[PDB]
């Protein structure tokens, strides 16, 4: 239902929908603040649902699920010339561990979204964004500061959840809409056993194909160097319809944040050159317009911004307050943002395409496709260039 050789993905993530992320929907977390004291704010969905209990969690989440993304969003996405969405979902939508605080119900809306996608000629990846015990310790896995995916029976539970996803969404019923199942979002390579992670990817690959599914398998790069995956799941070995998902940001360290705009652009262009050398189909499954980490709680609940020297011993670069509202941005910051967006688009269109993180946020403009588009910073149509040919690809 997609030609990965000839077509280019132009998509957005539907983030914050089925996995809560505080920086994306701060209104769900802010009621737990005690004045300026954030010490009692739950840091992730795990603790949010635990603190509320099953009844309050389900009431609040049903309202969230039913309003955050609707059919009208899918219409707008198509109208903007996008052809694709990536849908993050956590393991808990399908299976709970004993004593898990999570609530269920997300699958109902997942299936509505697949229909809305069909109706609007939009293709989809389903992405297992959170595994039991956490594969990365990020709040976007469900469970912050824990790295237990490879401990105990957590890997086997994850495979069982994937098998459910394979039987439901990897078959004939959705073969016109689903163009990939992503086995696991952002496993944190440096802290994991890479041999065991490869075995997990292979087991998921084989399990899906054994169901009779021809659906592409999407593997996240696990924060490895470009080309690391060139020799894994290869046509030589009879393994086929495999896509590598690279995520690209320049806001996670002080070194990245202190780069001037020209050096930001050079790094973006190089993402394109280097992805082109790889032997698998590859798609930039996450990226954004952010040149700062100023969005409230981007680094986590009760953590500040490296950009203003408020976290992790980072030096002060600039004040975040002026950058929280896009109406307050200087002309220079707007121009830098537009340049950066265009450079990334050119780099990512040089291989399989791109998937912006994310469609919408409550009030974080660097991270909202909608906000950037309405303010003229994201090209519309997406092929428009005010800064043509920054990278010089051929």
Curated annotation (Swiss-Prot):
One of its GO terms (biological process) is fungal-type cell wall organization. Changing residue 138 to A: Decreases catalytic activity. Impairs catalytic activity. GO terms for cellular component: cell surface; extracellular region; extracellular vesicle. Substrate binds at residues 21, 23, 186, 249, 256. Induction: Expression is maximal during the early rapid growth phase and increases during biofilm growth. Induced by caspofungin. Transcripts is also regulated by RCK2, SIT4, and HTG4. Disulfide bonds join 269-391, 294-320. It comes from the Eukaryota. It is found in: Secreted, Cell wall. Keywords: Cell adhesion, Cell wall, Cell wall biogenesis/degradation, Cleavage on pair of basic residues, Disulfide bond, Glycosidase, Hydrolase, Secreted, Signal, Transferase, Virulence, Zymogen. Disruption phenotype: Leads to enhanced susceptibility to the commonly used antifungal, fluconazole, during biofilm growth only. Transmembrane segments: none annotated. InterPro entries: Glyco_hydro_5, Glyco_hydro_5_CS, Glycoside_hydrolase_SF, Glycosyl_hydrolase_5. Its EC number is 2.4.1.-, 3.2.1.58. GO terms for molecular function: cell adhesion molecule binding; glucan exo-1,3-beta-glucosidase activity; transferase activity. Changing residue 223 to A: Decreases catalytic activity. Impairs catalytic activity. The active site is at residues 186, 286. Binding of human antimicrobial peptide LL-37 decreases the catalytic activity, which leads to the decrease of cell adhesion. It catalyses: Successive hydrolysis of beta-D-glucose units from the non-reducing ends of (1->3)-beta-D-glucans, releasing alpha-glucose. Monomer. Interacts with the human antimicrobial peptide LL-37. Major glucan 1,3-beta-glucosidase required for cell wall integrity. Beta-glucanases participate in the metabolism of beta-glucan, the main structural component of the cell wall. Can also function biosynthetically as a transglycosylase. Functions to deliver glucan from the cell to the extracellular matrix. Does not appear to impact cell wall glucan content of biofilm cells, nor is it necessary for filamentation or biofilm formation. Involved in cell-substrate and cell-cell adhesion. Adhesion to host-cell surfaces is the first critical step during mucosal infection. Belongs to the glycosyl hydrolase 5 (cellulase A) family. PANTHER family: GLUCAN 1,3-BETA-GLUCOSIDASE I_II-RELATED, GLUCAN ENDO-1,6-BETA-GLUCOSIDASE B. This is Glucan 1,3-beta-glucosidase. It comes from Candida albicans (strain SC5314 / ATCC MYA-2876). The gene is XOG1.
């Amino acid at each position: 239902a997609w030609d990965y050789d000839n077509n280019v993905i132009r998509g957005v993530n539907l983030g914050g929908w089925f996995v809560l992320e505080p920086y994306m929907t701060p209104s769900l977390f802010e009621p737990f603040q005690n004045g300026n004291d954030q010490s009692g704010v739950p840091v992730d969905e795990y603790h949010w649902t635990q603190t509320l209990g099953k009844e309050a969690a389900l009431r609040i989440l049903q309202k969230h699920w039913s309003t955050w993304i609707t059919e009208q969003d899918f219409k707008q996405i198509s109208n903007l010339g996008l052809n694709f969405v990536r849908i993050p979902i956590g393991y808990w939508a399908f299976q709970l561990l004993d004593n898990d605080p999570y609530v269920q119900g997300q699958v109902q809306y997942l299936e509505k979204a697949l229909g809305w996608a069909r109706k609007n000629n939009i293709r989809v990846w389903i992405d297992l964004h959170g595994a039991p015990g956490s594969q990365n310790g990020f709040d976007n896995s469900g469970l912050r500061d824990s790295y237990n995916f490879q401990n105990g029976d957590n890997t086997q539970v994850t495979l069982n959840v994937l098998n459910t996803i394979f039987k439901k969404y990897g078959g004939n019923e959705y073969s016109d809409v689903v163009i990939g199942i992503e086995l696991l979002n952002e496993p944190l390579g440096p802290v994991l056993n890479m041999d065991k992670l490869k075995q997990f990817f292979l087991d998921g690959y084989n399990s899906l194909r054994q169901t009779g599914s021809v659906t592409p398998v999407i593997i996240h790069d696990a924060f490895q160097v470009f080309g690391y995956w060139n020799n894994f799941l290869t046509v030589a070995e009879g393994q086929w319809n495999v896509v590598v998902d690279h995520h690209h940001y320049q806001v996670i360290s002080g070194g990245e944040l202190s780069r001037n705009i020209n050096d930001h652009i050079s790094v973006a262009c190089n993402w394109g050159w280097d992805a082109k050398k790889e032997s698998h189909w590859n798609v930039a499954g996450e990226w954004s317009a952010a040149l700062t980490d100023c969005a409230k709680w981007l680094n986590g609940v009760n953590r500040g911004a490296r950009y203003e020297g408020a976290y992790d011993n980072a030096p002060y670069i600039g004040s975040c307050q002026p950058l929280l509202d896009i109406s307050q941005w200087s002309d220079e910051h707007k121009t830098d943002t537009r340049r950066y967006i265009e450079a990334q688009l050119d780099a990512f269109e040089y291989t399989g395409g791109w998937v912006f993180w994310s469609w919408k946020t409550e009030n974080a403009p660097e991270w909202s496709f909608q906000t950037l588009t309405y303010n003229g910073l994201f090209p519309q149509p997406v092929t428009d260039r005010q800064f043509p040919n920054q990278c010089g690809f051929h």
